Paper text:
The RecBCD complex of Escherichia coli plays a dual role in bacterial cell biology, acting both as a phage immunity hub and as the primary mechanism to initiate the recombinational repair of double-stranded DNA breaks (DSBs). These exemplify two contrasting mechanisms for control of DNA break repair in which the RecBCD complex is either inhibited or co-opted for the benefit of the invading phage.
There was structural heterogeneity only within the RecD protein, suggesting that the RecD conformation becomes uncoupled to the rest of the complex when bound to gp5.9. A 3.2 Å resolution cryoEM map was obtained facilitating the building of a model for two chains of gp5.9, both containing residues 1–49. The structure reveals that gp5.9 adopts a parallel coiled-coil architecture in which the N-termini are slightly braced apart by a short anti-parallel beta-sheet. Many aspartate and glutamate residues are displayed on the outer surface of this exceptionally negatively charged protein (pI = 4.0). The phage protein engages RecBCD in a position which overlaps extensively with the DNA binding site and also with the binding site for the DNA mimic protein Gam. The overall structures of RecBCD when bound to either DNA or gp5.9 are almost identical, although small rigid body domain movements help accommodate differences in the dimensions of the two ligands. Many ion pair contacts are formed between D/E and K/R residues in gp5.9 and RecBCD, respectively. These imitate a subset of the contacts formed between the negatively charged DNA phosphates and K/R residues in the RecBCD-DNA complex and, on this basis, we can conclude that gp5.9 acts by DNA mimicry.
Numbering used by the authors:
A (entry chain D): 2 to 358
B (entry chain C): 511 to 1121
C (entry chain B): 149 to 984
D (entry chain P), E (entry chain Q): 1 to 49
The structure:
């Protein structure tokens, strides 16, 4: 009887046909509530949301019209989780299943894999890079003339150089491109004899050309040697072109088996980087590549459903750890504030916010 | 499947495929099989919406085939047709007329059935055949006198005066149209005045068309067969007409002659035999049958240029950076690489027809991929039963015991192969390759490089193409800087082994490889990996490191070269290929000598350094 | 009322697949192993029985019992092997001692070799009997083998186990025959059931139904009615008859008063065995009739040409190796006594044979040399004809030898190509005629398929660039590179192909191909290229066929699928798919022996008449019963009879090929050996039809063949050695071409006058909707969503053209004065199909 | 290499391939038998001595 | 359908014929050698017994 209501909801454009077909094929034998939850999860995945919380399944003042109509069929459930666990479709990840019940949320297998990949990458894949502090201090002093006060750009450059993966957060017109230019200029001066390969990427070609022009204008400001000028990247390209996305299929050229031929990577406007593209970009990178992300926390693309940077920069408000505060104080030659409490070391130590416009 | 009285395998069905594609949208294929079905990776993302629509289509069909199966009274069959039209079709301005016609015929059939008060059950096939026959019986004549020229069949009792009346298809046996009586018709046995037969109807239609022509009458028939150039005869009516015309009239200046000669001469004067092809020059001459179609005039004038040779020299410039995969793909098949890479020409159909039945055996790439995966699983000592269950969930393996026998034989062979690979395997890591040869930069990745050397295993028969690929990899490895020995194991105890080489010599040989790639990008290289390989293996002496020039050695080399080129009944041979056929239709000893020279030049180090 | 289907190959393959699914799937692994060893798949099984599925079912020698099953046969074979193994396991020690005691030469039977065999048999015996395969040493340990190697005058080793091995190895153990018989029966039943369900019929099915009806109890009244329908029946071409046809003809007309059955035929010209015609049917019919008549006058050929054949076929007592086919000498017409062929002022013999030098000769070298010699001789004939030295003379009248007179007869399509190339080397145009060919096998079909696939989707670059690179288009690599480099020309070509697709959608298939050929000058460049006329004719035929097919198809993509399906599997028996004549000009004609039957030619050349082929299949006819017998075991006794029938068919083909010549016939003969074991060994010419007549069925050598040829020669028959002719091309004088101009239309026909309606005058979108339904409510079009109706209000009534027509029909027949009747409205709604 | 080209039917070409392949199999068989014979006579000589 | 005719250079065709003659000669030589071996092994055996 639930199938007829699903078809009726499809006729009124309340639910997509793909969602209803998926629900019928997966949870046909299972409880009607399980089928309705699978259909709602497919609809949310079509909208672009990462997960469906079980609280949304519970009847509320604002809810899907179909859920209210199917209330009689589902009746009353004391716990949504216990009923779902019993179904063959939903599991906790121990066995391969189409849907995963993680905590209070429901995920698709592909979305759960991407979330786990991003979390594991930000937590443990990052490895600290120990370099000479005197050379770095001299280069930063050459980059930044004012050393009397704490400079957020100098701290951002120090964090980006001391850590593999890092994010420089800041609003438009706050001097992010100038900071990236100083970072690249310092990185080139750090290792002159060794081969350096810097790559630039952006989600859109418009932002790619904007980044190329701005980085050129910011790099021609400070004098560099010929060998240091050779290391400067020539141009940027679209992120889809960098991974070699085929027009017909979804397969990529630079998959996990074939890593990218780059050492340093910069990704401008990381706010438009959704979860699938981030999870696919993580796999292509090798273990020796340091990556830097550009964007702002308050941008709408960061807080949109499926984004990553919005939840990453959310912990930047806590501040740096106590030990990294002293480390950055010894590096930048100023007093770096320390954040209260300990929530996440590897995540908070790879973030920086530019509050000067 | 069970209704078709066939064993229900539970796979290779529409439901199975839909469940597979939806599981692919839900779950990644790397996870495994859920409820014995492997998810399908391709159906993912926004494009996956299409899958849903497809399911809806099937969701309709399975609904109707169940309902149409049961037999119902005539009264119940009325709402069906209409309900069947709105569910499957979105009607446009032109389609609504045909839909209304179908509904009208269906309603008329069921009304004629209900008029007699037939109460017994009626199957669907009866009404279906009745509908199919009535659709054939009905004809359209709404544009008979619309204003353009009328082209229709001869209808009885319809005689309208026309200035020009033409008749086509008057061959013997085609006209008059014949209809035989049932055989139990009492009227046909005893003819009576006023009876109507189709034969007499057509025999009188011919006279009606004769007398209806006001100004001009035209008659045409097929006198000669186009295939065999054999004589065909016209209808009896046209024959009687031409005989009467010949007997009645005589051509001027034929008064002296007798009646038969004059008749023959007159009948010859009215019959006009046209050409067999439209591009025949005889049509484009001043006369009665001069054509108005200047489309074939150029062909008749025979003024044209012959097709030149397809291959032409092209100026090519090497880019600064060339990937290693590019060089490997080029040296895989240079003759094909010229067409596929330089000209971007792929002689393949855009859509490949789906196999009619489920696979009962595995051949070609379907077997090769499974063998490669099984070998990769056995080299690392992984469980073969899990891979077997995965392939079973995929559905590639045959049903029942046949798939088990295939898997057992393949497991035995791959285990025998991997027993050698396990012994000479050491842990390693892939290193990025960046090299500069003659001003060209090569960037690549070499998987599973170990300090002992380069180890590769492929489940295929021994061939010189694998040796060329291994030699390219070995040159890249040695030029990058490292001490190692290259080893490649193949099917049936085949091994390609290369010792460590110096960096300078590796650069020297890679320079020749890059020059060969550059020459191939300009003009199609005449290098054959297999035929030239046999020629070198026969000519080259491994002990003395020299090319034998003995007449018997040369004769054996030519014999083996032609054997590897043309092949046996079982093996198509290297010569049989679309790309090779595109170059030359037939072999030439000049082409043979050029191929021998280039293949020797490019493949001599392979047999020289092979151990 | 029934329909007709041309092809049943798909039904045969589907029935075979269904039989495989039904039988092989429930088999256990132990039996599935043997089933897979015998056949890889259902298609491999169909490949064996496809010949026997068509036509009348053949009788199987030694048929397996019906009650027997596959598992029972497997258990029986396993029990036999187990008995043999158990006997060997007990006799593994006394054999060694017995062998030493036995007086058998050990030179044949080495102790070390014996030790190897003993160990090999012992290892095989110990292993579980999973499969039927047996070791080679069991053959060495057979009683008969031991009795052969045993020296005479001494004790012969004799054990019960040795006797058992001989009994076992006497007949091969397998399950093929049972599966073959069951598959034949099941596939025939399934195909018949499917065709009965669909209601369709076939050409063979009509004969089968008529035969089954005549044989049934109702057959008597049917035969009486048919006999009353036709009092006299005359059957022409009776040599090519089937058992069912003769059974029918006998049923209706045997021993019937006031009826006549005239069977006219020629047994010496029965060469259609591949179609299913049976000569043994004619042999059975000949014995049943006691009245035989013959025609003793030949009106076609010259007296010398008839005398040569009569002398050639009178050497042996039984020329056609069959007692039921006697040879009667025929006379010559009095009017044809004056005919003669004269070359260079000297009369030539009627029959001339060319002999190739050498003690032994291969097949390929023989064919090449004979093709070259035939080309040289044809060139010499043509040159002598043009100069006028060679003439064909009837009485005093003489005519020059033109190109239309000469003809070459070959047995296969591949040979024909070799003779065509040999003639092309000398610049002599030729035209090939055959009876079994399909236009879909040609490359032109594949190129047309690629062009259609490109036109259907011009937006995709890969398909359009692949179709442009076809040889039919005529574009080199330079043009392809120029088109790839420039985007503007590529976009122009894409727009052109889009226009082609529009023409395809609007006017049809052939109107698009016509414009495509006219725009790119395909026909002109094809006719300019050597050999392009055949390609152009094939293209035009394929275009006509594509038009005929797309006329009866639902969508445009359906036509591409139909073309691809016809290309993948082509039919040669179909008359429509037969390749047309290449050219209508008078050229040298290459015609197959089967097609040449019933035709006459002035000069005939047979370059490869000596070449023969041995058949391996064991399918024959009983000499006494005259019934087709198939031997599944394939015993040599059946292969010998099959070879004899093959040789008789070759003799008939040779007679048919020889009788065609009117004036002169030339044959190429040479000592042919399949595989030379020894130089002193006899040649395989005796197996050939011509060699058997030349050597009287006695194997000899090259010298013996030459001596027999010399002895046969007379005034009519002459022989000359074959040597390569001078490789000089035939020079043909140039011909002037008059100017050719097509007519022009000064006046253009006007489409102003037309009969129109308001809907057609105003509404263009309707199209042909007015033609289908003259009274269709075309005012309302573009139906919308009428899924649900809350209160069934008149506004919620279904909207469209059909509901509007229903509403109009309601008011059409309604009576205005009387009040509305609810039952009438209910009946109208029920008839219309709407809900109650 | 002589300019002259020789034409052979596709069916004709096969038989030579089978024949040459058959000769090689017979040759390989002859080699092993000869080696066994040589091994056997040498072994008997050692036993005799 | 273009695979009906096979074109080989005249020198190449002659070499194939030559290779076949040499294989036949080798076969004949192997035949005689084997016969000689079997004849020798029989005499040796008789001496042992």
């Amino acid at each position: 009887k639930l199938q007829k209501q699903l078809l009726e909801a499809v006729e009124h454009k309340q639910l997509r046909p793909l969602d209803v077909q998926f629900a019928l094929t997966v949870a046909g034998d299972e409880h009607p509530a399980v089928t309705l939850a699978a259909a709602l999860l497919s609809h949310d995945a079509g909208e672009g949301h990462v997960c469906l919380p079980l609280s949304r399944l519970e009847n509320n003042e604002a809810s899907h019209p179909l859920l209210a109509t199917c209330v009689s069929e589902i009746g009353e459930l004391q716990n949504w989780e216990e009923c779902l666990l019993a179904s063959q479709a939903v599991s906790r990840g121990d066995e391969p299943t189409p849907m995963i019940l993680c905590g209070d949320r429901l995920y698709l297998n592909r979305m759960w894999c991407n979330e786990r990949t991003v979390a594991r990458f930000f937590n443990e894949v990052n490895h600290a890079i120990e370099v000479d502090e005197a050379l770095l201090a001299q280069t930063l002093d050459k980059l930044f003339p004012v050393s009397d006060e704490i400079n957020w750009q100098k701290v951002a450059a120090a964090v980006a150089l001391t850590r593999r993966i890092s994010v420089i957060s800041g609003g438009p017109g706050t001097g992010k491109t100038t900071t990236v230019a100083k970072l690249l200029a310092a990185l080139i001066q750090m290792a002159d004899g060794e081969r350096c390969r810097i790559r630039l990427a952006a989600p859109t070609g418009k932002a790619a050309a904007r980044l190329t022009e701005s980085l050129g204008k910011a790099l021609r400001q400070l004098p560099l040697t010929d060998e240091q000028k050779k290391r400067i990247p020539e141009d940027a390209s679209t992120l889809h072109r960098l991974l070699g996305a085929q027009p017909g299929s979804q397969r990529l050229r630079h998959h996990a088996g074939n890593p990218l031929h780059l050492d340093v990577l910069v990704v401008d406007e990381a706010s438009m980087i959704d979860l699938p593209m981030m999870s696919r970009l993580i796999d292509a990178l090798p273990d020796h590549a340091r990556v830097i992300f550009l964007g702002d926390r308050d941008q709408l693309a960061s807080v949109e459903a499926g984004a990553v940077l919005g939840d990453i920069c959310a912990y930047a408000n806590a501040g740096f750890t106590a030990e990294r505060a002293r480390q950055l104080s010894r590096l930048t030659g100023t007093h770096v504030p320390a954040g209260t409490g300990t929530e996440a070391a590897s995540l908070r130590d790879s973030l920086c916010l530019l509050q000067k416009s | 499947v069970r209704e078709l009285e066939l064993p229900a395998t539970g796979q290779h069905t529409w439901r199975f495929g839909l469940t597979r594609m939806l599981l692919g949208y839900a779950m990644e294929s790397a996870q495994g099989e859920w409820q014995s079905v492997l998810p399908y990776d391709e159906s993912s993302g926004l494009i996956a919406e299409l899958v849903g629509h497809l399911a809806s289509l099937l969701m309709q069909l399975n609904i109707w085939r169940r309902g149409l199966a049961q037999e119902r009274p005539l009264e119940e069959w009325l709402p069906v047709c209409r309900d069947m039209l709105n569910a499957f079709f979105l009607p446009d301005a032109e389609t609504e007329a045909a839909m209304t016609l179908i509904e009208q015929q269906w309603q008329a059939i069921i009304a004629e059935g209900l008029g007699a008060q037939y109460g017994d059950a009626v199957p669907l096939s009866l009404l279906r055949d009745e509908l199919a026959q009535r659709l054939d019986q009905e004809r359209i004549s709404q544009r008979f006198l619309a204003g353009p020229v009328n082209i229709c069949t001869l209808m009885p009792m319809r005689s309208i005066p026309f200035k020009v009346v033409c008749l086509l298809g008057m061959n013997d046996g085609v006209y008059p149209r014949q209809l035989a009586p049932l055989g139990f018709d009492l009227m046909s046995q005893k003819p009576k005045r006023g009876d109507r037969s189709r034969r007499d109807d057509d025999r009188y239609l011919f006279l009606e068309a004769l007398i209806s022509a006001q100004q001009k009458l035209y008659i045409s028939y097929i006198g000669r067969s186009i295939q065999d150039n054999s004589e065909r005869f016209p209808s009896v009516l046209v024959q009687e007409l031409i005989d009467y015309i010949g007997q009645s009239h005589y051509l001027p200046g034929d008064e002296a002659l007798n009646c038969d000669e004059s008749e023959a001469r007159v009948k010859a004067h009215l019959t006009c035999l046209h050409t067999r092809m439209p591009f025949d020059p005889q049509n484009y001459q001043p006369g009665e049958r001069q054509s108005y179609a200047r489309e074939w005039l150029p062909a008749a004038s025979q003024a044209g240029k012959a097709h030149s040779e397809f291959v032409q020299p092209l100026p090519f410039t090497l880019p600064e950076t060339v990937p290693l995969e590019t060089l490997q793909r080029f040296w895989a098949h240079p003759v094909r690489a010229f067409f596929q890479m330089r000209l971007q020409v792929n002689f393949r159909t855009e859509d490949s027809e789906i196999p009619d039945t489920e696979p009962f055996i595995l051949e070609g790439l379907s077997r090769y991929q499974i063998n490669q995966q099984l070998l990769n699983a056995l080299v690392e000592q992984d469980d073969a039963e899990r891979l077997f269950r995965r392939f079973r969930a995929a559905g590639d393996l045959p049903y029942g015991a046949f798939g088990e026998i295939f898997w057992e034989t393949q497991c035995q062979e791959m285990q025998q192969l991997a027993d050698r690979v396990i012994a000479c395997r050491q842990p390693g890591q892939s290193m990025e390759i960046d090299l500069a040869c003659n001003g060209v930069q090569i960037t690549g990745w070499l998987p599973q490089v170990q300090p002992d050397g380069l180890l590769r295993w492929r489940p295929s028969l021994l061939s010189v193409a694998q040796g060329m690929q291994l030699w390219l990899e070995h040159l890249v490895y040695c030029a990058s800087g490292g001490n190692g020995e290259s080893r490649l194991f193949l099917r049936k105890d085949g091994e390609w082994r290369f010792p460590p080489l110096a960096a300078e010599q590796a650069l020297h040989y890679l320079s020749q490889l890059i020059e060969g790639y550059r020459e191939g990008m300009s003009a199609p290289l005449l290098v054959l990996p297999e035929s030239g390989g046999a020629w070198l293996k026969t000519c080259y002496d491994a002990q003395n490191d020299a090319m034998l020039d003995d007449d018997s050695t040369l004769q054996k080399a030519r014999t083996k070269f032609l054997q590897a080129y043309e092949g046996n009944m079982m093996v198509r041979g290297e010569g049989d290929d679309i790309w090779y056929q595109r170059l030359w239709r037939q072999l030439t000893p000049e082409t043979m000598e050029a191929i021998v020279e280039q293949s020797q030049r490019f493949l001599l180090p392979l047999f020289r350094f092979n151990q | 009322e029934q329909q007709l289907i041309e092809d049943e190959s798909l039904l045969r393959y589907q029935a075979c697949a269904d039989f495989w699914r039904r039988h092989c799937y429930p088999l256990p692994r132990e039996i599935a192993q043997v089933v897979f060893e015998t056949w890889k798949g259902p298609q491999a099984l169909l490949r064996d029985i496809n010949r026997y599925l068509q036509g009348e079912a053949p009788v199987i020698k030694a048929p397996p019992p019906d009650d027997e099953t596959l598992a029972s046969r497997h258990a029986q074979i396993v029990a036999r092997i187990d008995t043999v193994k158990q006997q060997w396991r007990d006799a593994v020690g006394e054999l060694d001692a017995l062998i030493e005691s036995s007086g058998i030469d050990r030179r044949k039977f080495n102790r070390s070799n014996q030790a190897k065999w003993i160990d090999k048999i012992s290892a095989w015996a110990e292993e579980e009997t999973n499969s039927y395969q047996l070791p080679e040493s069991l053959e060495k340990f057979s009683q008969r083998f031991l009795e052969d190697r045993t020296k005479a005058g001494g004790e012969t080793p004799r054990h019960p186990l040795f006797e058992a091995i001989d009994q076992l190895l006497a007949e091969p153990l397998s399950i093929r025959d049972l599966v073959i018989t069951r598959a034949l029966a099941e596939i025939r039943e399934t195909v018949a059931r499917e065709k009965r369900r669909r209601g369709e019929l076939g050409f063979d099915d009509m004969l089968s139904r008529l035969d089954s009806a005549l044989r049934s109890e109702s057959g008597e009244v049917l035969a009486a009615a048919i006999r009353t329908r036709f009092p006299v029946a005359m059957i022409d071409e009776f040599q090519d008859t089937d058992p069912q046809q003769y059974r029918i003809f006998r049923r209706i007309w045997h021993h019937q008063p006031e009826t006549a059955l005239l069977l006219i035929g020629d047994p010496k010209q029965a060469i259609y065995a591949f179609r299913g015609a049976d000569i043994f049917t004619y042999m059975k019919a000949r014995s049943e009739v006691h009245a035989h008549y013959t025609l003793d006058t030949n009106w076609r050929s010259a007296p010398g040409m008839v005398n040569s054949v009569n002398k050639l076929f009178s050497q042996t007592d039984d020329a056609f190796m069959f007692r039921e086919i006697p040879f009667i000498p025929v006379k010559s017409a009095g009017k044809n006594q004056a005919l003669r062929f004269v070359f260079k002022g000297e009369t030539q013999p009627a029959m001339k044979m060319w002999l190739m030098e050498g003690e032994s000769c291969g097949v390929g070298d023989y064919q090449s040399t004979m093709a070259q010699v035939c080309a040289a001789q044809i060139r010499d004939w043509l040159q002598a004809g043009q100069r006028g030295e060679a003439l064909l003379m009837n009485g005093d009248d003489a005519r020059p030898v033109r190109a239309s007179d000469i003809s070459v007869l070959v047995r296969s399509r591949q040979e024909a190509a070799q003779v065509r190339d040999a003639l092309t080397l000398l610049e002599i145009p030729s035209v090939y005629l055959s009876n079994r060919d399909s236009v879909f096998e040609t490359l032109e079909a594949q190129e047309m398929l690629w062009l259609l696939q490109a036109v259907m989707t011009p937006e995709r670059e890969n398909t359009l660039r692949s179709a442009l690179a076809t040889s039919m288009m005529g574009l080199n690599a330079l043009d392809i590179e120029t088109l790839n480099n420039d985007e503007h020309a590529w976009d122009v070509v894409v727009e052109e192909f889009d226009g082609y697709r529009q023409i395809w959608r609007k006017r049809g298939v052939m109107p698009m191909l016509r414009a495509l050929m006219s725009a790119r000058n395909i026909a002109e460049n094809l006719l300019a290229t050597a050999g392009g006329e055949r390609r152009l004719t094939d293209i035009l035929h394929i275009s006509e066929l594509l038009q005929e097919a797309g006329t009866q198809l639902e969508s445009e993509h359906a036509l591409v699928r139909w073309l691809s399906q016809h290309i993948l599997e082509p039919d040669s028996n179909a008359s429509s798919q037969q390749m047309r004549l290449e050219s209508d000009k008078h050229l040298v004609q290459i015609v197959t022996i089967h097609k040449s039957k019933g035709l006459e030619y002035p000069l005939v050349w047979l370059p490869f008449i000596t070449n023969f082929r041995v058949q391996e299949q064991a399918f024959y006819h009983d000499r006494h019963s005259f019934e087709a017998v198939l031997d599944l075991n394939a015993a040599p006794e059946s292969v010998d009879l099959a070879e004899a029938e093959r040789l008789a068919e070759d003799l008939r083909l040779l007679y048919v090929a020889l009788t065609r010549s009117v004036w002169h016939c030339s044959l190429g003969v040479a000592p042919l050996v399949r595989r030379r074991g020894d130089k002193k060994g006899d040649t395989d010419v005796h197996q050939s039809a011509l060699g058997r007549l030349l050597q009287k069925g006695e194997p000899q050598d090259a010298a013996g063949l030459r001596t027999c040829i010399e002895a046969l020669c007379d005034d009519d028959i002459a022989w000359q050695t074959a040597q390569t002719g001078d490789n000089q091309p035939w020079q043909v004088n140039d011909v002037s071409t008059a100017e050719l101009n097509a007519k022009t239309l000064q006046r253009l026909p006007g489409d102003n006058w037309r009969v129109t309606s308001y809907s057609g005058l105003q509404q263009r979108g309707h199209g042909i909707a007015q033609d289908l339904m003259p009274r269709l409510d075309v005012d309302a079009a573009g139906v919308a969503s009428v899924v649900e109706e809350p209160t069934l209000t008149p506004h919620q009534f279904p909207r469209g053209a059909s509901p509007g027509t229903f509403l109009h029909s309601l008011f059409e027949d309604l009576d205005f004065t009387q009040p509305v009747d609810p039952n009438w409205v209910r009946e109208k709604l029920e008839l219309g199909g709407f809900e109650s | 290499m002589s300019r002259d080209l020789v034409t052979i039917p596709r069916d004709v070409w096969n038989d030579i391939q089978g024949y040459i392949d058959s000769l090689e199999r017979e040759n390989d068989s002859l080699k092993n038998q000869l080696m066994e014979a040589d091994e056997y006579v040498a072994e008997l000589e050692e036993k005799l001595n």
